[PDB]
Design a protein around this ligand. Structure first.
Ligand code: NI
Length: 341
């Protein structure tokens, strides 16, 4: 049965609620983004209206085979009426296609559902600037001050400089990047661009990338692994055994692997600057963990919320333990007392 923090009161609507069967009274199911914990339950047999971005709708049709008649894509930054209620989709600065949803309830209440997001000051000049929000359903993934990490731009500067140095010292090195979902495409696209290579990958992952409206993509990716010196592999294979095995398959073209694992936060963020990051090495194989996040840091989250000044906050992440819920509630009250709302 569908939990309360996935229901929008005063509407027939649910958010990211596909794993509960037919939800009683739901007339439209919104999907914020194409990540498995959020789409869990959708397939070609789904027969209710799904509201989402254009990119999410390309993935629903091609990857999960949802029939076209039930997919309702909306443009961003545009007031739309759905089943008699005004809504707006806003860019979430998460993975490709990911949105926040503003609902303008018939009674005058305004609700923002962030989905998954990485808060940014640019959001302070979207259509959020123009009116008050009563309720915030918030992505609280990293809602604790110990969660620090660098900007995406610093992380990509590190990756590009590292890969270019390596391959210029040894033209026979291969670069490998891990993946398990959409998101974090800048990692492998930026490295391939500095090296003058396309990115090589499986047919399944090429298919997923072709749904994402990325400009000039045919110029950047390929299924011909032999023509490429940046390969994508599943995240589970990014270890010394899996990489050894891959190097065997390359027919003696290469004699060294430099590999990247984009993670979210890890506790090595509590000690080490991005500049100081070092790999794990065994023989001719080196693996770097790089903290490329598509969720808000604590500080980014706090800034957004203190700007928005919501009357009530409903967390959507870390909701399963009393200790988590109490920690989050304490920071929300600190933020409100400090800012004065
Ligand atoms: Ni996500």
């Amino acid at each position: 049965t569908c939990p309360f923090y996935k229901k929008i009161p005063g509407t027939g609507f649910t958010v990211d609620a596909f794993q509960y069967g037919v939800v009683e009274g739901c007339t439209a199911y919104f999907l914020t983004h194409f990540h498995s914990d959020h789409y869990a339950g959708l397939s070609k047999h789904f027969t209710f209206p799904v509201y989402c971005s254009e990119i999410t709708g390309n993935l629903l049709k091609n990857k999960l085979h949802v029939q076209e008649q039930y997919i309702h894509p909306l443009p961003l930054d545009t007031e739309c009426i759905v089943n008699g209620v005004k809504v707006v989709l806003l860019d979430a600065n998460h993975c490709p296609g990911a949105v926040m949803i503003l609902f303008y309830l018939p009674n005058g209440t305004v609700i923002l559902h962030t989905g998954d997001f990485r808060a940014d000051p640019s959001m302070e000049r979207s259509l959020l600037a123009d009116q008050k929000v009563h309720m915030l359903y918030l992505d609280t993934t990293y809602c604790s001050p110990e969660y620090t990490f660098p900007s995406q731009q610093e992380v990509i500067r590190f990756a590009i400089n590292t890969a270019f140095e390596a391959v210029t010292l040894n033209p026979h090195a291969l670069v490998v990047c891990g993946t398990y979902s959409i998101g974090k495409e800048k990692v492998f696209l930026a490295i391939a661009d500095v090296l003058g290579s396309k990115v090589g990958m499986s047919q399944e992952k090429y298919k997923t990338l072709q749904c994402l409206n990325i400009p000039e993509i045919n110029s950047l990716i390929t299924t011909d692994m032999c023509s490429s010196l940046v390969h994508l592999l599943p995240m589970m294979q990014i270890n010394f055994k899996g990489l050894q095995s891959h190097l065997k398959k390359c027919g003696g073209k290469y004699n060294q692997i430099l590999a990247f694992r984009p993670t979210g936060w890890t506790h090595s963020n509590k000690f080490t600057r991005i500049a100081d990051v070092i790999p794990q090495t065994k023989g001719n194989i080196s693996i770097y963990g790089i903290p490329y996040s598509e969720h808000s840091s604590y500080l980014e989250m706090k800034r957004f919320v203190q700007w928005l000044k919501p009357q009530k906050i409903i967390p959507t992440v870390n909701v399963g333990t009393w200790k988590s819920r109490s920690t989050m509630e304490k920071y929300f009250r600190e933020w409100k007392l400090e800012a004065g709302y």
